[PDB]
Curated annotation (Swiss-Prot), chain A:
The isolated toxin complex includes 3 peptides starting between residues 768 and 778 of this protein, which might be physiologically relevant. The chain holds residues 795 to 829 of 1364 of the full protein. Signal peptide: none annotated. This is Toxin subunit YenA2. It comes from Yersinia entomophaga. Disruption phenotype: Cells with a disrupted yenA1-yenA2-chi2-yenB-yenC1-yenC2 locus are no longer pathogenic in C.zealandica larvae. It is found in: Secreted. Part of an orally active toxin complex (TC) with strong insecticidal effects on larvae of the Coleoptera Costelytra zealandica, Acrossidius tasmania and Adoryphorus couloni and some Lepidoptera larvae. The TC has an endochitinase activity. Semipurified toxin complex consists of at least YenA1-YenA2-YenB-YenC1-YenC2-Chi1-Chi2. The Yen-TC:K9 subcomplex is about 26 nm tall and 22 nm in diameter with 5-fold symmetry and 5 copies of YenA1, YenA2, Chi1 and Chi2; the chitinase subunits may be solvent accessible on the exterior the complex. The Yen-TC:K9 subcomplex has no insecticidal activity. The native complex with additional YenB, YenC1 and YenC2 subunits is 16 nm taller and is insecticidal; the toxicity-conferring subunits are present at about 1 copy each. It comes from the Bacteria.
From Swiss-Prot, chain C:
It comes from Yersinia entomophaga. Disruption phenotype: Cells with a disrupted yenA1-yenA2-chi2-yenB-yenC1-yenC2 locus are no longer pathogenic in C.zealandica larvae. Part of an orally active toxin complex (TC) with strong insecticidal effects on larvae of the Coleoptera Costelytra zealandica, Acrossidius tasmania and Adoryphorus couloni and some Lepidoptera larvae. The TC has an endochitinase activity. It is found in: Secreted. This is Toxin subunit YenA2. The isolated toxin complex includes 3 peptides starting between residues 768 and 778 of this protein, which might be physiologically relevant. Semipurified toxin complex consists of at least YenA1-YenA2-YenB-YenC1-YenC2-Chi1-Chi2. The Yen-TC:K9 subcomplex is about 26 nm tall and 22 nm in diameter with 5-fold symmetry and 5 copies of YenA1, YenA2, Chi1 and Chi2; the chitinase subunits may be solvent accessible on the exterior the complex. The Yen-TC:K9 subcomplex has no insecticidal activity. The native complex with additional YenB, YenC1 and YenC2 subunits is 16 nm taller and is insecticidal; the toxicity-conferring subunits are present at about 1 copy each. The chain holds residues 927 to 975 of 1364 of the full protein. The gene is yenA2.
UniProtKB/Swiss-Prot annotation, chain E:
It comes from Yersinia entomophaga. Signal peptide: none annotated. Semipurified toxin complex consists of at least YenA1, YenA2, YenB, YenC1, YenC2, Chi1 and Chi2. The Yen-TC:K9 subcomplex is about 26 nm tall and 22 nm in diameter with 5-fold symmetry and 5 copies of YenA1, YenA2, Chi1 and Chi2; the chitinase subunits may be solvent accessible on the exterior the complex. The Yen-TC:K9 subcomplex has no insecticidal activity. The native complex with additional YenB, YenC1 and YenC2 subunits is 16 nm taller and is insecticidal; the toxicity-conferring subunits are present at about 1 copy each. Part of an orally active toxin complex (TC) with strong insecticidal effects on larvae of the Coleoptera Costelytra zealandica, Acrossidius tasmania and Adoryphorus couloni and some Lepidoptera larvae. The TC has an endochitinase activity. It comes from the Bacteria. It is found in: Secreted. Disruption phenotype: Cells with a disrupted yenA1-yenA2-chi2-yenB-yenC1-yenC2 locus are no longer pathogenic in C.zealandica larvae. This is Toxin subunit YenA1.
Amino acid sequence: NELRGLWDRIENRIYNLRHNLTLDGKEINMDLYDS
Amino acid sequence: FANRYGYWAANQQLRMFPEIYVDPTLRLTKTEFFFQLESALNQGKLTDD
Amino acid sequence: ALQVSKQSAQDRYDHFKELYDENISSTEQKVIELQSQAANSLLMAQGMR
Amino acid sequence: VSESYRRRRQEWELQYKQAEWEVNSVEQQINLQNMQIKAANKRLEQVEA
Amino acid sequence: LDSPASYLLDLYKFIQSVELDGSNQARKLETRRADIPKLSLDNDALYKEVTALSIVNDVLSGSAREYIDQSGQADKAV
């Protein structure tokens, strides 16, 4: 079960790094408002 | 069956995946010498030396 | 601003399952064992007499 | 000491990250003030009209 | 490989070989309380098997209502 949890963890972390600008949070875009 | 869910499935998988069961925390009989490795590694923060 | 303020309480709450549980670890057990091991103080002197 | 140095970091870990998120929370209160600055200007011109 | 079924069958094939016989109630009651290893539908229904207390009503009442039929006292009365 550890192999299957491990390879899925690295796939999720690559997806996050491939977006970058989240850091799984929201670094770049925040507090903006309109109207 | 005293306590049930997850506890039952572990009856097989804790034998059927040996890599779950392998750890340095063995049933150690070698107490006359294996303590003489650990009492030097018995440090809170340490280095490669 | 109300949706932002929620995290001030929620981040202060949801960490603490790492402290109201797992409140002990294997190193701070040995901090007791090497004190209570002095139960041999019934035996430590007897070869004197 | 090996446990105490491990326990110590957690108090500063929480203290920085809560303060960092209140540095995030205060940004809404300063951005909100533009609306009352606009309202006061959109108020004054009506008495002149 | 392991499943809700491998947990259940490890009980079911175990209770079958608790064989002591004669006048004793235990199997007589269990077979009167009838259900079987393939009750209804199939094992993949589990997510839609989520149900309220209403599931119990026909297990009690559905045998109970047979008394007028069994005794022969009435039948046309629903």
